[PDB]
Design an enzyme around this catalytic site. Structure first.
Site, PDB file in Angstrom:
ATOM      1  CB  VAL A  18      -0.942  -0.082   1.134  1.00 52.87           C
ATOM      2  CG1 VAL A  18      -1.671   1.465   1.292  1.00 52.87           C
ATOM      3  CG2 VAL A  18      -2.081  -1.067   1.141  1.00 52.87           C
ATOM      4  CE  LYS A  33      -5.620  -5.209  -2.083  1.00 52.96           C
ATOM      5  NZ  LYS A  33      -5.718  -6.039  -0.639  1.00 52.96           N
ATOM      6  CG  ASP A 135      -7.842 -10.160   7.591  1.00 54.03           C
ATOM      7  OD1 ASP A 135      -7.547 -10.784   8.534  1.00 54.03           O
ATOM      8  OD2 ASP A 135      -7.089  -9.248   6.943  1.00 54.03           O
TER       9      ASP A 135
END
Lengths: 337, 337
Positions: A18, A33, A135
């Site tokens: 990133v 990203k 996540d």
């Protein structure tokens, strides 16, 4: 670099420091990203982010733009570049800064942060939206400590789950992995995110992850060590091949001993809510809009309640989108709206 | 679709997710494995087969040729093609054929097969060879019942291990994974193959895989179910963060109860050898050249012992390469050479 005139235009909209940078125009901070494009495949993250941007939720990071660029080791390869609103402070850094000084983050911060985290998945899990993050962890939660605000980020593992299509488990960082994911169920639900959020809650109050497995076996170990042996029903539903209860043998550790070095004036309320989030059985984990009405959050409604620096609670804390209001029960609309 | 003239010439020695064919020259059956060449990388498998081809061990498949071919999905991509000797029967097929008819394989066949399989990894593990196969399973063992011979094949997952470089675990097929691999140790030894072989011995006597996990946790569960709770030392040495032994409240199941349905009665020697191989501690697992001296193999020394078809035992059963004799102790040389 650029693979397109459109991409070159979008690239020149931002300056990189990133990858982190800022919208040259409005001054807003952003992260970029970069992910390979495969001719065979379309990227889920982009579509998810584009769906979410239409809602513009106060507790979800906002897509700014996307653009494409060529590769270095191979100019044949195209790379998608997604640009999201960004801020440098994460929930992890925020909490670590207190615990590093042998203190804990103020209880009301812990409480206001959690309310907003629960809010982010409430919206994600709407039937209308149906995004499973997969996540959720302290590194993927952005916070403004002074303002008391919080935004969920990093949808690089997100997927809109469906019954008709199976799923992998490994995309979720291990410490935050729900039991059904530890058991490798190809089909699971958005309740895997509720587990993750319950793990962060515990983490805000402990100063380290509550279930710190060095491996998949170890991860199950640490959960069982604290929550105790799962029932027949649980193992039968989530791990049918290995239902032997004597190989999951523990009484558990009550929350009072887990959180030995840190105290809350409403420990019994927090532990109730924590327990409801960390239920072994997915359908029995408390769902976001029910969690938001839990007694642990009652004081957030009191106009006398303020942030640790005596500042007001964030503007939007109770600003719910029509999308959300439409799905709420009457009792939830009474309490939250 | 050759990549050069050498590759064209080699391809035309033979005729046809592997490719089965014969060597026109000698009529010999062969297997042709193709794997992507990446310009950044060298192929471990080829170099390994080339090293082993020098030795020409009677229980390891022998490399016949290597050639390169261009892609179909992309003519830019080159593929290594490895050609090795092949026979139609895997140890898996061989046993399936017996257990299909509710029958156990012949005890002398199991015995003669294990001697040779243990022999192969004894060679692989010599310090001068130092190859670790990492995916020993019955599909990767080739046998010929008619003459009783066995060959270890498929060095696709193999590696010459060293303490300077960490390793992955997922290469070894799950059911055959040693405890240190289930725990995710990045550093491990050749003993991971001693375990695999132990798992196959048990599979030869059971008619299905002995430890069948649906997941990594489940794989440990099944090992513990049989071998009983591991010692604190075991957990200390293989899983340092998760040493609470109380969670694994299992005394194990004796081998005589595991192999109930196909009861043998040379059984005590077989169960003793199985227990010697399937030890939790890598370093405690019986080493191949010691395992070859176990009493279970006493029968194979008698010139009067025959395969079930009344043919003599394999000619090269006790023909050891100098490679091997130099490593053997005097007690081992005495019994074997």
């Amino acid at each position: 670099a650029a693979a397109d005139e459109r991409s070159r235009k979008e690239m020149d909209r931002f300056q990189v420091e990133v990858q982190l940078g800022k919208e040259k125009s409005t001054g807003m901070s952003v992260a970029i990203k970069k992910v390979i494009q495969d001719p065979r495949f379309r990227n889920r993250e982009l579509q998810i982010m584009q769906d979410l941007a239409v809602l513009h939720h106060p507790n979800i990071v906002q897509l700014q733009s996307y653009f494409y660029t060529l590769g270095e080791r191979d100019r044949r390869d195209i790379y998608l570049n997604v640009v999201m609103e960004y801020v440098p402070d994460t929930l992890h850094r925020c909490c670590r800064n207190y615990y590093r000084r042998q203190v804990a983050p103020p209880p009301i911060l812990i409480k206001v942060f959690l309310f907003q985290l629960i809010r982010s998945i409430g919206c994600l899990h709407l039937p209308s939206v149906n995004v499973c993050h997969r996540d959720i962890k302290p590194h993927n939660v952005l916070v403004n400590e002074a303002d008391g605000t919080l935004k969920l980020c990093d949808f690089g593992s997100a997927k809109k789950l469906s019954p008709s299509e199976p799923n992998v488990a490994y995309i979720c960082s291990r410490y935050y992995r729900a039991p059904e994911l530890i058991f490798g169920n190809q089909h699971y639900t958005t309740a895997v995110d509720i587990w993750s959020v319950g793990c962060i809650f515990a983490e805000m109050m402990l100063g380290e992850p509550i279930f710190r497995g060095d491996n998949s076996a170890g991860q199950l170990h640490e959960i069982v060590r604290v929550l105790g042996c799962p029932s027949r029903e649980v193992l039968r539903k989530l791990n049918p091949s290995h239902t032997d209860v004597d190989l999951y043998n523990s009484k558990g550790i009550p929350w009072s001993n887990v959180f030995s070095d840190h105290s809350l004036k409403d420990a019994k309320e927090a532990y109730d809510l924590l327990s409801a989030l960390l239920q072994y059985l997915p359908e029995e984990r408390m769902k976001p809009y029910e969690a938001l009405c839990h007694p642990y959050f009652d004081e957030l409604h009191d106009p006398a309640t303020k942030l640790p620096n005596n500042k007001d609670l964030p503007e939007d804390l109770f600003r719910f989108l029509p999308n959300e209001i439409e799905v709420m029960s009457e009792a939830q609309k009474a309490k939250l709206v």
